Amino acid sequence: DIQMTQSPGTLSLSPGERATLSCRASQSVSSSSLAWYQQKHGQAPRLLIYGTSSRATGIPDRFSGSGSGTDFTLTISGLEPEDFAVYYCQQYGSSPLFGGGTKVEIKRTVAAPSVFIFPPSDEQLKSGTASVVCLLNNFYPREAKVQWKVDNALQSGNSQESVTEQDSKDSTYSLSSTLTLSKADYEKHKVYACEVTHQGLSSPVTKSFNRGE
Amino acid sequence: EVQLLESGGGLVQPGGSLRLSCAASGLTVRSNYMNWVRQAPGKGLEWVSLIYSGGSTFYADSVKGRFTISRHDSKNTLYLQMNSLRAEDTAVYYCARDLVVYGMDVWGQGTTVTVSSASTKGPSVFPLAPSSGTAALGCLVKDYFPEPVTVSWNSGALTSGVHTFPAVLQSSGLYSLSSVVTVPSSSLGTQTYICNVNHKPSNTKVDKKVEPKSC
Amino acid sequence: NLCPFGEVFNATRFASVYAWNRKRISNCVADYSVLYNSASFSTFKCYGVSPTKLNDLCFTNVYADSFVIRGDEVRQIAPGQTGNIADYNYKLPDDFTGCVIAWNSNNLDSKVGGNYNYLYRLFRKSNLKPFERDISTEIYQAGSTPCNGVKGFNCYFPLQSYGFQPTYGVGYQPYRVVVLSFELLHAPATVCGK
Ligand SMILES: *[C@@H]1O[C@H](CO)[C@@H](O)[C@H](O)[C@H]1NC(C)=O
Ligand SMILES: [Cl-]
Ligand SMILES: [Cl-]
Ligand SMILES: [Cl-]
Ligand SMILES: [Cl-]
């Protein structure tokens, strides 16, 4: 079997800069079998390049492909705002096979998040469940670590996260994490905390509350 | 004018069946390599099925024995019969004309297939009340099915600082999202904040006032 | 005298799979000892007859078909197969009686920078019948508009090159294939094994 690998997963550049997107094959393949696709958020993929280096119809000159054997490259000269999307390479053996994709995002200076923690509402507690929510607001870059702590015990396996798309105005991300417990389990602990680690923070920031205060 | 118009996606329970249609114009399905490519929510593209003009068919290992690609020459339409559906089959399905060495040049707009044993259910809207510079408050829209919901604030008058997060699928099979907004802390005691949650699949409309919580 | 199997196996150049060559072997004594006693064959599968039993059988005519495909396509040179080669380039019958022989020819058929002389038909409207040979280069019509021999949208050249490079993986390296068809027709036999 062949395996395709795109790197990096995320490319962070400013408009006008040159993007270099890698696609690697697990075995050496003919250059005619490698193609590139662009997919903007909420849209169907479109073909950029076929045969490693042949630009498809209507694709702007700033897109170009190169490589051979196991290494293939998509190059975007002079990035445009419309060019910040995901890009998939595809190797064609007996059937098509797509790489994992590479996201091309907008570069900006590092911005630490604002952290807020929300205790479960009394209305939800009557139902028998407790959701605790941790909000990380307008940070960059997207890499952020949220650590739930319950009476200083590090929680694992009872939270889910969700991240917004890069903001159109400030190019930041926001994240919310939900810790979900039963009311009985919630009533068995006092201190609920989320500890946030991020490049913009020189030390992890913790926001917490005491159950019933 | 070239176009691949797909339809047939919708709610199906696991083990059920569903057939997708891909009506083409500007190209002859009978004369082409045709593919189905799917994309699970948040994940990458995955090739699923291929049919030759000569009639040979090929399938990804994840769908072999369950899916069948086919066409109708007269109707110039490509089909995908999906049997024994599974939760992981939940995805947007695209049809594409395939030129192999020249790539997949023509794509459809996609059609959404949702595979779940959950039943239609309106959400519960809980407040995310600010702590006693900038304050944050929000609405927890918990336990609804299926997607989507829409959340506005103050009937669309408050948009600056709003983040409505993508929903997560809980282990119960129900979705759950949060919607927050940041405001100057001075306006907590002078401005009312109401999130407007709409869940069309159940005609559930909830207006929840979010206030600071008094001891 | 002997059957000229050497002119086929030891040919200095092979044909493209789409325009595969056929050698009609008649009125000669064939020895299948040397063929199976070789160690340079990566593929040697017989269908309907044992390769050691051929020295005991007589056939009306023996056909030696030869061409080049890439490593991963050799599996399609068998009865009951599907794919670009089996469907559009070289098709064996479901009741095929014969042997399929193949070997890696990366030392002969691949060039640094690519050997673009070997081609295969990529676009065809329907499947080949068994032992059909399509050497057409007509522009392939992929839509309702006729092409009139001009390339463009929905109008594609039907042949594609392999561009064999020696640094390719074995799945993409060239393989020479010889297909021995034993036609047990109903006429005075001419090719016996000895
Ligand atoms: C092909 O040539 C080699 C080397 O001379 C020889 O050993 C072999 O017997 C030949 N094969 C046939 C079928 O004549
Ligand atoms: Cl509390
Ligand atoms: Cl409610
Ligand atoms: Cl036969
Ligand atoms: Cl040409």
> Of the candidates A29, A32, A94, which has its C-beta nearest C169's C-beta?
A29
Is there a contact between C23 and C30 (Cβ–Cβ < 8 Å)? no
Residue A87: CB atoms within 10 A of its CB come to 25
Alpha-carbon span B137 to B180, nearest angstrom: 6
**For chain B, how long is the longest CA-to-CA vector?**
75
Q: Which residues pair with A135 in a beta bridge?
A: A116, A176
Note the helical H segments in A21-180.
122-127
Note the helical H segments in chain C.
6-9, 33-36, 84-88, 106-109
**The two three-digit tokens of residue A152, written as one number:** 């200083």
Residue-range domains of chain A with CATH: 4-106 (2.60.40.10), 114-210 (2.60.40.10)
Alpha-carbon span C194 to C142, nearest angstrom: 52
Alpha-carbon span B6 to C158, nearest angstrom: 28
Q: What is the distance in angstroms between the Cα of A74 and the nearest Cα belonging to chain C?
A: 21
Ligand 1 site-directed mutation target among C10, C35, C99, C101, most atoms within 8 Å of CB: C10
- Would you call A109 helix, strand, or coil by DSSP? coil
Residue with tokens 């089959």: B89
- CA proximity to A134, closest of A191, A172, A176, A182: A176
**β-strand pairing of B124-128 with A173-182:** unpaired
Sheet strands side by side (includes A153-154): A153-154, A145-150, A191-197, A205-210
**Which ligand neighbours the alpha carbon of C150 most closely?**
5
- Would you call A145 helix, strand, or coil by DSSP? strand
Residue B61: CB atoms within 10 A of its CB come to 7
Residue B155 φ/ψ, nearest 5 degrees:
60, 40
Alpha-carbon span A206 to A185, nearest angstrom: 22
CA distances from A66 to A22, A131, B151 (A): 10, 50, 45
Q: Which CATH architecture has domain C6-122+161-193?
A: 2-Layer Sandwich (3.30)
**Which ligand neighbours the alpha carbon of B123 most closely?**
3
- CA proximity to C89, closest of C138, C126, C139, C132: C132
Task: Nearest chain A residue to B214 by CA: give it.
Answer: A213
Q: For residue A8, say if its preceding peptide bond is cis, omega within 30 degrees of 0.
A: yes
Alpha-carbon span A15 to A24, nearest angstrom: 26
**β-strand pairing of A173-182 with A102-106:** unpaired
**What residue segments make up the domains of chain C, in order of their start?**
6-122+161-193
Beta strands in B56-149 (DSSP E): 57-59, 67-72, 77-82, 91-98, 106-107, 111-115, 124-128, 134-144
Is there a contact between B118 and B145 (Cβ–Cβ < 8 Å)? yes
Resolution (A): 2.4
Alpha-carbon span C74 to A101, nearest angstrom: 32
Residues 6+ apart with CB under 8 A from A1: A26
Q: Ligand 1 pocket, C5 CB below 6 A?
A: yes
Residue type for position B58: F
**The two three-digit tokens of residue C127, written as one number:** 């499947």
**Cα-only R_g, chain A:** 22
Is there a contact between A134 and A107 (Cβ–Cβ < 8 Å)? no
**The two three-digit tokens of residue C125, written as one number:** 């409207």
CATH 2.60.40.10 fits B3-115, yes or no: yes
Is there a contact between B5 and B42 (Cβ–Cβ < 8 Å)? no
**The two three-digit tokens of residue B29, written as one number:** 């399905």
Alpha-carbon span B83 to B92, nearest angstrom: 16
Residue C104 φ/ψ, nearest 5 degrees:
-70, 125
Sheet strands side by side (includes A114-118): A114-118, A129-139, A173-182, A159-163
Is there a contact between B26 and B3 (Cβ–Cβ < 8 Å)? yes
**The two three-digit tokens of residue B61, written as one number:** 């290992």
- Would you call B164 helix, strand, or coil by DSSP? strand
Taking CA B30 as the corner, what is the angle to CA B74 and CA C116, rounded to the nearest 5 degrees?
A: 165
Alpha-carbon span C147 to B209, nearest angstrom: 66
Q: What is the CATH number of domain B124-210?
A: 2.60.40.10
**The two three-digit tokens of residue B169, written as one number:** 């699928």
Numbered ranges of CATH 2.60.40.10 in chain B: 3-115, 124-210
Query: What are the b/e assignments for B124-143, b being 16+ CB within 10 Å?
Result: bbbbbbbbeeebbbbbbbbb
